């Protein structure tokens, strides 16, 4: 299906052999600290190592200014990248934060605003030649046709990315579940996820422990592993290449079993 | 989709509103005992109650002779049925065991041999007017076309059932995952499960903690919740009306989330 590999500098990711697991890193910051403290960064590193040991293929790291956001995240990327042999993505929508994070050692950019909040981030991406995840987002829930609108919206991000020099192969899409969508809309997007495929890019799903799962099951954030699991399984069936998750152990197993079944 | 309800005597099951959960009952027998002992039956009852409390819609209860099999199972059905307001299925392929179990208070018959080991069980079913689950089974793995063969095989069971007087509405099918199939064949059957639907009957999936999950994940029986989960999710996507499971709590949540998503 994919005639290319996601090239991530020193690491290469194969889009065909298995669903790729993106682990979500704890960023619990130290009070008293601007960033880089031993407690912050060591807690971070230990979590990255755990996620690595549990089957994570990527480590995702990401109010508050840009000056600060950098002081916070840069020390973490520097440490995790040295100590965890695994590609790193920076979870930011800010061009300068993305620039700093890549200089620090991040391999992938992860923009929850699909390059629309700071189009210059697409230029950063083009320049450094790193994959960029463009997630579906908007400031309203005023759709006329959820999926058609989503696809139009995502496609507007593809345009910004390609206009900036981003190679097709460095583009990944994200339905932006839990964003700018009612609970019912999130379920509808899940139900029709396979439609994103016609756009011709790898798809990352990010549903981990989200509010719509709590809304279906009526369970708090810490009781959402089974709901996340369902969404991950459905997502894999519908052709997604990555899943962004907190529970790396559990979701790796479900993903692996799904992979085996869908052949 | 279903213009009828599964009628189970005092209980009625709706095939449309949600995936129905069949909990698998522990039958840990007492040594020294022929059956009916306080420890056996109380352990059984407590488990049925737990499964009830965890979201189970049916309680499934089932070397060794027929005389004995009855002495073992009958006391359990009598107690569980009195004390757990939930339909009960007897897991047997023996006509007389099925007869005794229904007299005891079982509502559904569950035949892993699809009425081929003891065709008279279909007559028991017709007579008492209870739903019967016909599972796919055979004494060899010598297929020419797994799915086509399976469908032919299941259909041979439908014939035995209908020839005996079994109303269409009292028929449920089961792909018989983990039976007469290599690991690779089990995965293939999972992958193509939706094909069972053309037969026009409700489908029950029974994959809980099975060996093929252990074979994909390389994990022991007690470490198979995530694998079971995957198979349950896939199965629901492919149109199954029931799932037969050990982990009632966890699988109820995954099922419920799947239901919400697939609308
Ligand atoms: C730990 O989870 C979060 O930090 C919650 C939100 C803020 C979040 N951040 N970034 C994301 N990035 C992609 N690509 N897809 C997502 O669904 C997503 C999110 O849901
Ligand atoms: C606790 O699990 C078991 O007792 C293992 C086997 C023996 C088993 N018994 N009956 C079944 N009945 C239906 N309908 N579908 C099944 O997959 C199944 C089975 O897998
Ligand atoms: N079944 C495929 C999985 C590819 C990745 C699925 N997201 C192989 O094996
Ligand atoms: N989504 C359906 C579920 C029906 C049962 C699915 N096995 C309603 O709600």
What is the DSSP track for A112-145?
A: TTTTSS-THHHHHHHHHT--EEEE---S----SS
Going by their DSSP bridges, the two strands B88-91 and B108-111 should be labelled as parallel
Cβ neighbours around B12 below 10 Å, total: 10
- Contacting residues for A165 by C-beta, under 8 A, at least 6 apart: A122, A123, A126, A127
Any idea which ligand is nearest the CA of A242? 3
Are B77 and B61 spatial neighbours (Cβ–Cβ below 8 Å)?
Answer: yes
Domains: count for chain A: 1
- Contacting residues for B10 by C-beta, under 8 A, at least 6 apart: B107
Question: Is B210 among the catalytic positions?
Answer: yes
CATH code (residue A221): 3.20.20.20
Listed residue (A125, A60, A62) closest to A92, CA to CA:
A62
Q: What angle do CA A231, A263, A197 make, to 5 degrees?
A: 55
Report resolution (Å) to 1 decimal.
2.2
Rounded to the nearest angstrom, the minimum Cα separation between B241 and chain A is 16
- The CA-atom distances, in angstroms, between B70 and each of B25, B90, B92 are 16, 11, 10
Are A227 and A219 spatial neighbours (Cβ–Cβ below 8 Å)?
Answer: yes
- What are the residue numbers of the active site of A? 210, 244
As a whole number of Å, the end-to-end CA separation of chain A is 12
DSSP annotation string for A138-178: -S----SSHHHHHHHHHHHHHHHHHHTT--GGGEEEE--TT
Going by their DSSP bridges, the two strands A132-135 and A108-111 should be labelled as parallel
- The CA-atom distances, in angstroms, between A68 and each of A51, A100, B157 are 26, 12, 69
Q: Which of A18, A205, A231 to mutate to test the pocket of ligand 3 (most atoms within 8 A of CB)?
A: A18
- Token code pair at residue A200: 């011709």
Q: Which of B244, B245, B251 to mutate to test the pocket of ligand 2 (most atoms within 8 A of CB)?
A: B244
Breaks (C-N over 2.5 A) in chain A follow: 62
- The CA-atom distances, in angstroms, between A53 and each of A26, A48, A191, B190, B228 are 16, 9, 32, 29, 22
Rounded to the nearest angstrom, the minimum Cα separation between A52 and chain B is 17
Residue B127 backbone dihedrals phi, psi, to 5 degrees: -55, -50
Domain that holds residue A20: 1-263
Listed residue (B20, B169, B9) closest to B105, CA to CA:
B9
Beta bridge partners of B203: B173
Are B200 and B155 spatial neighbours (Cβ–Cβ below 8 Å)?
Answer: no
Taking contacts as CB-CB distances below 8 angstroms, the residues of chain B near A229 are 226, 229-230, 233, 254, 257
Give the strands of the sheet with B108-111, arranged side by side: B171-174, B132-135, B108-111, B88-91, B58-61, B20-24, B242-245, B204-205
Q: What is the CA radius of gyration of chain A?
A: 17
Cβ neighbours around A39 below 10 Å, total: 11
Q: Is B130 helix (H, G, I), strand (E, B) or coil?
A: coil
Are B260 and A187 spatial neighbours (Cβ–Cβ below 8 Å)?
Answer: yes
CA of B17 to the centre of ligand 4 (A): 5
Q: Which residue has the CA at smallest separation from atom 4 of ligand 3?
A: A18
Q: Is B128 helix (H, G, I), strand (E, B) or coil?
A: helix
DSSP state of B1: -
Distance of CA B206 to the CA centre of its chain: 6
- Contacting residues for B165 by C-beta, under 8 A, at least 6 apart: B122, B123, B126, B127
Taking contacts as CB-CB distances below 8 angstroms, the residues of chain B near A227 are 253-254, 257
For chain A, where are the E strands, in sequence order?
Answer: 6-8, 11-13, 20-24, 58-61, 88-91, 108-111, 132-135, 171-174, 204-205, 242-245
- Token code pair at residue A110: 């992860």
DSSP state of B203: B
Q: Is A104 helix (H, G, I), strand (E, B) or coil?
A: helix
CA distance A255 to B175: 23
Residue B17 backbone dihedrals phi, psi, to 5 degrees: -75, -30
């Amino acid at each position: 299906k994919w005639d290319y590999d996601l090239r991530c500098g020193e690491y290469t990711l194969n889009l065909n052999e298995k669903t790729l697991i993106m682990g979500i890193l704890n960023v619990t910051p130290d009070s008293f600290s601007d960033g880089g403290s031993y407690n912050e960064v060591d807690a971070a590193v230990r979590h990255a190592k755990e996620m690595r040991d549990e089957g994570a293929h990527i480590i995702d790291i990401g109010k508050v200014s840009v000056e600060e956001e950098i002081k916070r995240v840069v020390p973490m990327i520097q440490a995790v990248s040295k100590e965890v042999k695994l590609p790193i993505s920076i979870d930011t929508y800010k061009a300068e934060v993305a620039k700093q994070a890549i200089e620090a050692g991040a391999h992938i950019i992860n923009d929850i605003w699909g390059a629309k909040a700071e189009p210059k981030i697409a230029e950063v991406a083009a320049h450094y030649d790193v994959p960029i995840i463009l997630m579906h987002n908007r400031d309203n829930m005023n759709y006329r046709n959820l999926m058609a609108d989503m696809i139009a919206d995502l496609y507007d991000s593809i345009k910004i990315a390609k206009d900036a020099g981003v190679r097709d192969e460095n583009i990944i899409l994200d339905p932006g579940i839990g964003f700018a969508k009612t609970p019912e809309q999130n379920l509808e997007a899940m139900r029709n996820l396979e439609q994103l495929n016609v756009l011709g890019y790898p798809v990352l799903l990010g549903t981990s422990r989200k509010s719509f799962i709590g809304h279906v099951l009526d369970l708090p954030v810490e009781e959402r592993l089974e709901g996340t699991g369902a969404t991950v399984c459905l997502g894999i069936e519908k052709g997604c290449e990555f899943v962004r998750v907190h529970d790396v152990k559990e979701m790796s197993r479900m993903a692996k079993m799904m992979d085996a079944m869908i052949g």
